[PDB]
Amino acid sequence: WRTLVGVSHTNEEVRNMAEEFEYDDEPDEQGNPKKRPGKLSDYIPGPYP
């Protein structure tokens, strides 16, 4: 996501684009899986698992 900033989009625009997807996070204090919205350091996700 960070490679689109300053090339075809604005920083504030790419952040909104990434936040519409979900990524695996660190497990909580009990060890269960968690999810979080995307960041600029993430990669563009694909349609199939």
Partner: protein, 76 residues
């Protein structure tokens, strides 16, 4: 009227290096020291720490190195 001796003395030295040879070479060594600093400035021009301390203050050349990218085009 007449001369029967030769008055002389020994000059200060240590090995192959004498005091008279050092005074002859002193002005030239300062130019080499000056020319060595200039060569260092050529090879450290891309170093940002040296840019913010020395090169950015040079008139007509300093402002050239400045980056003016607005924050909205920087990911980091």
């Amino acid at each position: 009227a007449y001369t029967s001796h030769l008055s002389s003395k020994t000059g200060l030295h240590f090995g192959r290096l004498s005091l008279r040879s050092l005074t002859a070479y002193a002005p030239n060594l300062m130019l080499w020291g000056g020319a060595s600093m200039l060569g260092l400035f050529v090879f450290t021009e891309g170093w940002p720490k040296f840019q913010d301390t020395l090169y950015k203050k040079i008139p007509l050349l300093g402002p050239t190195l400045e980056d003016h990218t607005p924050p909205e085009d920087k990911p980091n």
